[PDB]
Amino acid sequence: GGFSEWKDPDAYTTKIVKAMESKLFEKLSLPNQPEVSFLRYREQIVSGVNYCMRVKIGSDFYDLHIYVPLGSTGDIKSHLIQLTDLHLAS
Amino acid sequence: GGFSEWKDPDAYTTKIVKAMESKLFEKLSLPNQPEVSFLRYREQIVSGVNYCMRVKIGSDFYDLHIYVPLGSTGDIKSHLIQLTDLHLASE
């Protein structure tokens, strides 16, 4: 949940900005395709596994939607595991 | 929809379900800590990078929120790059 410090453009991120220009001009309704000047960027790695856990409690069956960020397990940094959703398997 | 086939429980996922039992009981308002039986699971790896791109268009400054999934770049499988949000830097 933490973005990096601001960084100067590089070739890798410039290619990503240029790749998005089509979608940019549409979300802005700018049709003449005005120049897009790339000034700086921040980044945030996001890695993890979403789990759908089927569990029985009482006579009822549930879907437990759980997100485990990279670096966490059931034993390591387990406070960062998220219970994202819970509902009857129905 | 990006999720694996159903899998039998394993040591790794069983520990994760056991860790979540407190939050389970509380969300359900079940006070006596009944047995939670773990039957099967499926998983979906999600990996990539969120970019905040500061750009100028005409005389205005924007934050461009772009998500690049692992395995994608500006040149490789670039059709999977997502423009998640766009707004004036001043907002």
Side-chain angles (χ1 to χ4, degrees):
Chain A
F3 277 89
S4 72
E5 291 181 350
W6 288 107
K7 329 179 160 216
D8 293 336
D10 49 29
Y12 180 95
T13 56
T14 299
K15 277 186 202 169
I16 291 167
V17 166
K18 170 143 163 254
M20 289 296 96
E21 272 175 1
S22 179
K23 302 176 147 232
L24 209 181
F25 294 136
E26 301 175 305
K27 210 174 226 91
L28 275 186
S29 311
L30 273 52
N32 300 353
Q33 295 197 15
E35 187 176 291
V36 176
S37 298
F38 179 31
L39 306 186
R40 48 169 160 152
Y41 74 93
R42 291 184 282 206
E43 61 174 44
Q44 160 201 67
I45 288 47
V46 175
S47 190
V49 178
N50 290 295
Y51 292 98
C52 183
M53 312 295 210
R54 177 64 49 82
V55 302
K56 187 184 197 198
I57 320 169
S59 63
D60 287 308
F61 289 92
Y62 299 80
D63 284 342
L64 253 74
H65 297 265
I66 291 167
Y67 179 70
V68 182
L70 180 70
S72 294
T73 76
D75 274 355
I76 300 175
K77 288 199 195 59
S78 43
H79 69 275
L80 295 177
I81 300 167
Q82 303 169 18
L83 175 47
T84 81
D85 202 16
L86 178 73
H87 56 79
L88 291 169
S90 300
Chain B
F3 282 81
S4 73
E5 64 286 8
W6 286 106
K7 296 184 174 175
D8 291 333
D10 57 23
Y12 185 86
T13 51
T14 295
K15 278 196 191 184
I16 288 165
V17 175
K18 178 160 148 184
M20 290 301 87
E21 268 176 4
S22 146
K23 301 175 119 155
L24 263 187
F25 297 146
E26 157 174 59
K27 182 150 199 202
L28 285 175
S29 314
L30 302 191
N32 49 315
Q33 293 177 141
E35 203 172 317
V36 184
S37 288
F38 179 32
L39 308 185
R40 46 165 153 157
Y41 75 92
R42 44 174 181 158
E43 61 177 23
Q44 168 198 67
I45 300 170
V46 175
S47 182
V49 174
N50 285 126
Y51 293 95
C52 194
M53 316 288 203
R54 180 61 54 73
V55 302
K56 183 181 185 177
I57 317 166
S59 46
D60 295 297
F61 294 95
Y62 300 88
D63 288 346
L64 255 60
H65 293 281
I66 296 165
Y67 175 71
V68 181
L70 157 77
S72 290
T73 73
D75 276 338
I76 305 166
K77 305 177 178 280
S78 49
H79 67 284
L80 296 171
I81 297 167
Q82 302 167 9
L83 177 47
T84 65
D85 207 1
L86 169 64
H87 57 79
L88 291 154
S90 67
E91 305 171 358

